[PDB]
Amino acid sequence: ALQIPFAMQMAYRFNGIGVTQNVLYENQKLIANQFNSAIGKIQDSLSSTA
């Protein structure tokens, strides 16, 4: 395991889908808010029905 800062991991992962790294870094707070919100929606989905 090689440590890497989590934003820089996402920058590699965006570059892995042909989206240029700066499209992450210029939007990092938006992307974090979307991700954190989406995880919250999984808890609601799982809580709502078995």
Place this chain on the structure above:
Amino acid sequence: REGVFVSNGTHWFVTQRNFYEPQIITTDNTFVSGNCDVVIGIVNNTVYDPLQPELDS
């Protein structure tokens, strides 16, 4: 453009992701976007420009 920025503690280099091979950071190794306000955790170093040593003529 490819690889990642690193420093040994004093000098900044670009290097490829899976094998340490430091290179000077240049206008050829990089691409510009935006400005210094936007990026979280950006840092200050010279970027070298291979045209200017030629235009020193």
